[model samples]
Target: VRFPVPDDITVKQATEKCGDQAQLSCCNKATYAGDVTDIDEGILAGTLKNLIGGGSGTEGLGLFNQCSKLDLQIPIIGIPIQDLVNQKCKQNIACCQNSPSDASGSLIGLGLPCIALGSIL
Candidate 1:
């Protein structure tokens, strides 16, 4: 599944701050924060709305719909936006819960292989 490119969002190395939007590319390796930091908070806020509430499982399905319906399959460190956000951003958003687990079906279907939940005790 894929999502559209955010009109306002652009990168520095791959797309530059105000350069071409069509030539979308992955941000460089973080070596510390991981490539997840490359995405703009604006992009995150907009894209992540689908992940809100977890409803305790309330939002994952919406994101899944967006990932399927509006899905663009853009690359982030070679990962699609929706799935990238779902997997990486999930480190903090666990409040919504189960979406990560259910995501095994909705998400990793790309064979994304979201790292198994471990060491959270």
Candidate 2:
């Protein structure tokens, strides 16, 4: 499903759109995290330091791409927003965790590989 690129959008809207797929693809666990929203809000308010500009085409794509690797088990929306956006986690949060145990086992069970298994082992 393709989302329309609006001429203008709020950081909230951008987050929502990027997460829509994660929500639908998962079971009932798709709940948007407050931290993620807070981060976006901070970015829009210029309180949070992010290189990604809010409400821009680049921002939407970047944010979505950042979330692309998450297994659809927890629903991207439900993930702790900070986890999804963490510096190293940008490519994939489950993969960036300090330990595979740090990530939820349920999430791993959903088929998202422990990409960072090399580090953990």
Candidate 3:
């Protein structure tokens, strides 16, 4: 599926677009240390794709393409996918335990950034 432009989407947006199955698939195959399975599904999926092929999946070029898609400023020296994921997670405020309060019912109004840092990770 195609993600929006700014790339920084929200948990709701990701779920609406990527779906739970895709997110679970990504979480199950993630190559990092975070508990993505419990976090936003899309973030988990993005993590899986980012760490796919063992940090260089889809061949070296494929990994680079994913990196570029995320717009991350990662160097070509093969930085760990976990580090990348963590940085992106923090920036988006989409961490597993950082779910929106039930008081709001819907966080779409909070305008919180989602895990669209796929390119960076």
Candidate 4:
């Protein structure tokens, strides 16, 4: 999912929120080729995550990377749009939170002990 933001769907939703907004050139800020706007990022990320509830950290990370990277293509950093917005949606809204609890029950945690013991054995 290059954007996870479907052109036909989420993009339209984002447009409604940020459309009367910035660039993307084709109208909406998501498509806007200029500097990434905070409003657009929040709107776009909220719509993108909520549009379809993705539950994988790996995939979610990929989304963040691509989404934020898209913003940086224009440089002039900030939260990098997705990094800020996605963090809000995922961190504040729907994904695994950056909590002590989340860290303890993860697959990586399970794998670490298993691998360490196996190596010693």
Candidate 5:
């Protein structure tokens, strides 16, 4: 469903109505009115780090545990905060793990091309 609010309301107001921590959904970091040049480097580094297995499953488990430590009891309000915290933590922690075995599993990590494909599906 689409927003039914009048156009006169501000974007900030709309985001606030959704949640206090929310930003204009359309205002992404790359498209913001500012110097986004350096942002590419961070993006590339993050991409490569993830691709090269710079992160591992143990770290992910730790990160999950850390996140679960938070007392986020509310869905509309607390869930977003918990998500933000997890995102920041993963970005910081995952970049350092560099291991393919992080996802190794009997179902997926077995490295069998067929099982792996089905696992992801």
Candidate 6:
């Protein structure tokens, strides 16, 4: 029984729980969007709680995994999603902070500042 209500019953229960104030927070940018500002399961779960009273059952488990994994790389931790998506799009790289080939060393001649900052920062 999470924010998204992964099921009809939870959604209904949450709706009733909040009475008239129950505004479907899920599928609505305001709720999840704010949660996305800071990547963490707790924040996301909190936002979901406001919507569906808890979580989307098992369906909500991996909602924050993608964001969580980003923390593995220090530089990737602070970079926004737009930047990550762009770097990966242009060079088809995953962890933009590291060289696509080495992943553990500098991408000296790659010519991508964002990626370079990953090393310097």
Q: Of 5 and 6, which scores higher on TM-score?
A: 6
Each model's lDDT: 0.24, 0.25, 0.28, 0.23, 0.23, 0.25
lDDT of 4 by residue, 4-103 (tens): 3222322223323322222111101122211333223333333333322432122221112112111213232564332233322221111111222343
Q: Give the TM-score of candidate 5.
A: 0.19
Q: Which ten residues in a row have the lowest lDDT in candidate 4?
A: 112-121
Off by over 4 Å in 1: 1-37, 53-121
RMSD, each candidate, Å?
A: 17.1, 16.8, 15.4, 18.5, 16.9, 19.7
lDDT of 6 at 105: 21
- Give me the candidate number with maximum TM-score: 6
Clashes found in each candidate (C-alpha, N, C closer than 3 A): 9, 1, 8, 3, 7, 5
- Candidate with more favorable, higher TM-score: 2 or 3: 3
Stretches of candidate 6 exceeding 4 Å from the true structure: 1-14, 17-21, 25-38, 50-58, 61-121
Runs in model 4 lying further than 4 Å from the true structure: 1-35, 55-121
Tell me the TM-score of each prediction against the true structure.
0.17, 0.18, 0.20, 0.18, 0.19, 0.21
**How accurate locally is residue 29 in candidate 3, as Cα lDDT from 0 to 100?**
16
CA lDDT, candidate 2, residue 71: 35
Model 6 agreement with the true structure over 1-121: per-residue lDDT tens digits: 1222212223233334433332222211111222344333453333333334432431232121111112212333475322232222222111122213332123323222111111111
lDDT of 1 by residue, 1-121 (tens): 1222233332222122112221222221111112335323343233323433122211111111111111224456564443432322212111111233452234334322111111010
**Given candidate 1, what's the lDDT at residue 13?**
22
Question: What ranking emerges by TM-score with the best candidate at the front?
Answer: 6, 3, 5, 2, 4, 1
Off by over 4 Å in 5: 1-5, 27-121
TM-score, structure 6 vs. true: 0.21
Off by over 4 Å in 3: 1-7, 24-88, 91-121
lDDT (0-100) at residue 77 of candidate 6?
46
**Lowest lDDT block of 10, candidate 6:** 112-121
What does candidate 2's lDDT look like per residue over 1-121, in tens digits? 1222232422233334444322211111211212255223222222111212233322211121222343322334765443222232222221211123433423323332212211111
